[PDB]
Every structure is written in structure tokens, then in C-alpha cells.
Amino acid sequence: EIIPVSTTLELRAADESHVPALHQLVLKNKAWLQQSLDQYTSQEETRKHVQGNILLHQRGYAKMYLIFCQNEMAGVLSFNAIEPINKAAYIGYWLDESFQGQGIMSQSLQALMTHYARRGDIRRFVIKCRVDNQASNAVARRNHFTLEGCMKQAEYLNGDYHDVNMYARIID
Amino acid sequence: VEIIPVSTTLELRAADESHVPALHQLVLKNKAWLQQSLDWPQYVTSQEETRKHVQGNILLHQRGYAKMYLIFCQNEMAGVLSFNAIEPINKAAYIGYWLDESFQGQGIMSQSLQALMTHYARRGDIRRFVIKCRVDNQASNAVARRNHFTLEGCMKQAEYLNGDYHDVNMYARIID
Numbered sequence: 175e176i177i178p179v180s181t182t183l184e185l186r187a188a189d190e191s192h193v194p195a196l197h198q199l200v201l202k203n204k205a206w207l208q209q210s211l212d213q214y215t216s217q218e219e220t221r222k223h224v225q226g227n228i229l230l231h232q233r234g235y236a237k238m239y240l241i242f243c244q245n246e247m248a249g250v251l252s253f254n255a256i257e258p259i260n261k262a263a264y265i266g267y268w269l270d271e272s273f274q275g276q277g278i279m280s281q282s283l284q285a286l287m288t289h290y291a292r293r294g295d296i297r298r299f300v301i302k303c304r305v306d307n308q309a310s311n312a313v314a315r316r317n318h319f320t321l322e323g324c325m326k327q328a329e330y331l332n333g334d335y336h337d338v339n340m341y342a343r344i345i346d
Numbered sequence: 347v348e349i350i351p352v353s354t355t356l357e358l359r360a361a362d363e364s365h366v367p368a369l370h371q372l373v374l375k376n377k378a379w380l381q382q383s384l385d386w387p388q389y390v391t392s393q394e395e396t397r398k399h400v401q402g403n404i405l406l407h408q409r410g411y412a413k414m415y416l417i418f419c420q421n422e423m424a425g426v427l428s429f430n431a432i433e434p435i436n437k438a439a440y441i442g443y444w445l446d447e448s449f450q451g452q453g454i455m456s457q458s459l460q461a462l463m464t465h466y467a468r469r470g471d472i473r474r475f476v477i478k479c480r481v482d483n484q485a486s487n488a489v490a491r492r493n494h495f496t497l498e499g500c501m502k503q504a505e506y507l508n509g510d511y512h513d514v515n516m517y518a519r520i521i522d
Contacts, residue, residue, distance in 0.1 A: 260506045323499015
């Protein structure tokens with residue numbers, strides 16, 4: 175399963191075989207990843223999450239895609255949870271540091287939202303991120319999500335509770 | 347038996363199999379306005395849909411991923427007070443409830459909510475309590491305001507019910 179983005183960009187459904195290269199991306203970006211809700215070791219842990227999401231990807235309450243830029247794995251774009259009757263989904267994402275600042279995540283997100291909206295599966299796209307994560311809040315604001323609120327101490331990470339912004343975008 | 351005391355009049359009893367009969371009858375009795383509620387699924391009507399719903403929730407309750415309490419007023423079943431979901435890692439829970447029409451406007455939810463939150467907060471396993479309700483539900487919004495919840499935001503078209511997508515207010519309270 176491929177979802178086209180541009181002539182250099184595409185979205186690929188996460189595979190078992192992607193794991194060796196994905197875990198390397200995770201290791202390489204660990205300093206950024208451990209500060210974001212999108213969270214914590216071994217390669218088996220990475221394959222666990224991938225196999226876990228393939229199962230959800232099939233049965234329809236999550237999706238896990240990988241951004242490939244000129245046939246190179248650049249990052250991760252997913253629907254964390256999916257509410258099929260509400261037609262809502264929560265978005266998880268991150269990009270490899272060396273790929274930042276090109277509009278890659280933005281083009282990927284817009285393409286993935288567009289794909290799912292015109293098939294009628296999802297119309298409400300939600301982002302939750304730490305108030306203090308500048309990069310995550312930028313992805314939301316940069317992609318025309320509306321800030322719906324601020325959830326006080328909503329998420330535990332690294333020994334403390336964090337305020338979380340909720341953003342949403344409706345595409346009918 | 348798990349019982350959380352509320353008053354000399356009120357208590358919360360963990361839902362069990364044997365409650366299903368009277369619960370189903372209370373659902374039927376209150377079908378008209380429950381139809382607008384987010385807090386009872388509107389595709390569970392038959393006594394067997396209800397049992398499967400309660401059996402599912404008894405299991406979530408035991409594991410700590412939800413709670414389902416029945417409100418008892420002088421030995422009569424008055425309504426339901428739930429944590430629709432619990433996130434153990436966040437110590438956060440989403441509250442759902444409804445009362446039979448004849449037990450409404452008496453302060454029963456206020457008392458039951460204060461008792462539930464205190465019970466869970468005192469022990470330190472849930473600190474963040476959340477109410478999501480439709481913007482257009484005046485009673486639900488009032489209950490959140492009387493019970494020391496703060497409006498955190500408004501989710502546009504978050505909830506599909508009766509042919510349409512509805513805006514929902516999110517309220518929270520932190521205890522501890």
C-alpha cells in the first residue's frame with residue numbers, strides 16, 4: 175500500500191521488513207523522540223510497535239505510514255486511534271532531524287488527510303502535543319489546525335505530568 | 347461487594363451480573379432522553395445487549411481500565427456513574443453518568459461525583475477527572491460547573507449522534 179505525495183515523496187504502510195531501518199532512525203533521533211508524546215530501548219520494542227500497528231492497520235482503528243523521500247525513509251506518520259462512527263483520528267508524527275525544514279511532513283500530512291477524507295473514513299483530525307514542544311505545536315499551526323484547548327497535566331512522560339494542547343482540523 | 351459510601355441515603359455499588367435485569371428496565375424507562383445522551387450507547391436496547399455491555403465493563407472495572415458503579419438511593423437503583431475510560435499511565439479518567447428521571451434535580455450526581463473523585467484521589471491512583479459533554483446539553487454543562495470542573499476546550503463536531511456531528515466541551519479537575 176502506497177499513498178502518493180509528490181514526485182519525490184510517498185507514504186508506505188509500515189512492514190515487518192522496515193524494522194531494521196526504522197529502529198536506526200529511532201536510535202538516531204532519540205534525543206528528540208524522548209521529549210515528545212509521539213516515547214521511550216531495544217529493536218524488538220520497535221518491531222513490537224510495528225507489528226502491533228499492522229494489526230490495528232488491518233482491523234481499522236489505527237494506521238502507520240512511513241515517509242519515503244527519494245526511496246529513503248525520512249519519518250513516521252500515523253493515526254494513533256480512530257473513532258469510526260465519529261470519523262475522527264488522532265495523529266502521531268515525527269521526522270528524522272536531517273529531513274526537517276523542507277515541508278516534507280506538511281506535504282505528507284496534507285496528502286494523508288486528503289486521502290482519508292475523500293474515502294469518507296475520517297473527517298476530524300486531531301493533534302495532541304505538549305505545550306512546551308515547539309516543533310510539535312508548529313506542525314499543528316503550520317498545517318492549519320485550530321487550537322481547541324489546553325488539557326492540564328494530561329500526559330505522564332519522564333517522571334512528570336505535562337499540559338497538552340489539542341488541535342483539530344475538519345475536512346468534510 | 348465493592349461499595350463506595352456517599353451518604354446515609356446514597357451509595358455506589360460496583361455493577362455485577364445480577365444488576366442487569368433492573369438496569370435494563372431503567373434504560374427502557376428512560377429511553378426518550380437517553381437517546382440524546384453520550385453516556386449510554388444507543389444501539390444497546392435489548393436485555394441481552396445490556397448484559398453483554400455490563401459483562402464487558404465488569405471486566406474493564408476489575409482490570410482498572412474503566413469503572414461502572416450503580417447509584418443506589420435507599421436500596422433503589424437510581425442511575426449509573428462510570429469512568430468510561432481510565433489511563434493508568436496518566437492517572438486520568440473520563441466520567442460518564444445518567445440518572446433515572448425521578449431521581450433528577452436532587453443533588454444526587456453532585457454528591458455521587460464528589461464521593462467517587464475523593465475515593466479515587468485520596469488513594470492517588472486517579473488525579474485527573476474529565477467530563478466531555480455536548481455543548482447543547484445544559485444540564486450536563488451545569489453539573490460540571492457545580493462540581494469544580496474547569497472548561498479546558500471545545501471539540502468541534504467531535505461526536506456523532508442521531509444523524510449529526512456535535513460540538514463537545516471538555517472539562518477537567520485535578521485532585522492532588
